[PDB]
């Protein structure tokens, strides 16, 4: 589980959603596993704007933020989960790592702000959900 908290936005992994995010919904992409709800309180995170390859990611299953390279967003295969059927998702960067079901929604960082957040894992891998295209977040 996790989110990010940026203005009077909330980014969470969309097959991770609350019947509360999708009665405030601002957007969501079942391709990017991304969800954005609109929230009362302002967040306290920044979106990086940046082509950062290297940074932090906090894995729940060990209680540590574990420093990785990470590849470039792209269309990957992901297997068939209990969430989705096997697909192509967009926007994916991976990265070696652990990484178990529950550890979605862990925040990656650089030095500009947050990069995404976990959204795929495995076989000593760990899949992010690029955010750092998303403008948007930073404004309305
Ligand atoms: C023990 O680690 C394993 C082993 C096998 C599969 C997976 N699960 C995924 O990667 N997810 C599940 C949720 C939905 C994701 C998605 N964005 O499609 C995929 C993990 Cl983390
Ligand atoms: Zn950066």
């Not at 509360?20 to 967040?43: I, M």
């Not at 729940?60 to 990957?76: M, N, T």
């Not at 989705?84 to 960082?109: K, N």
């Given at each position: 589980?996790?989110?990010?908290?940026?203005?009077?936005?909330?980014?969470?992994?969309?097959?991770?959603?609350?019947?509360?995010?999708?009665?405030?919904?601002?957007?969501?992409?079942?391709?990017?596993?991304?969800?954005?709800?609109?929230?009362?309180?302002?967040?306290?995170?920044?979106?990086?704007?940046?082509?950062?390859?290297?940074?932090?990611?906090?894995?729940?299953?060990?209680?540590?933020?574990?420093?990785?390279?990470?590849?470039?967003?792209?269309?990957?295969?992901?297997?068939?989960?209990?969430?989705?059927?096997?697909?192509?998702?967009?926007?994916?960067?991976?990265?070696?790592?652990?990484?178990?079901?529950?550890?979605?929604?862990?925040?990656?960082?650089?030095?500009?702000?947050?990069?995404?957040?976990?959204?795929?894992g495995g076989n000593?891998l760990?899949?992010?959900?690029?955010?750092?295209?998303?403008?948007?977040?930073?404004?309305?």
């Amino acid at each position: 589980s996790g989110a990010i908290y940026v203005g009077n936005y909330r980014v969470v992994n969309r097959h991770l959603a609350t019947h509360n995010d999708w009665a405030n919904l601002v957007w969501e992409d079942s391709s990017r596993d991304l969800l954005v709800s609109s929230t009362t309180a302002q967040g306290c995170d920044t979106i990086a704007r940046c082509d950062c390859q290297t940074g932090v990611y906090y894995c729940s299953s060990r209680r540590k933020h574990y420093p990785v390279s990470f590849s470039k967003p792209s269309l990957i295969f992901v297997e068939a989960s209990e969430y989705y059927p096997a697909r192509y998702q967009s926007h994916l960067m991976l990265a070696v790592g652990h990484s178990e079901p529950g550890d979605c929604g862990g925040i990656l960082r650089c030095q500009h702000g947050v990069v995404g957040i976990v959204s795929t894992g495995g076989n000593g891998l760990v899949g992010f959900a690029d955010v750092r295209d998303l403008l948007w977040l930073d404004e309305e």
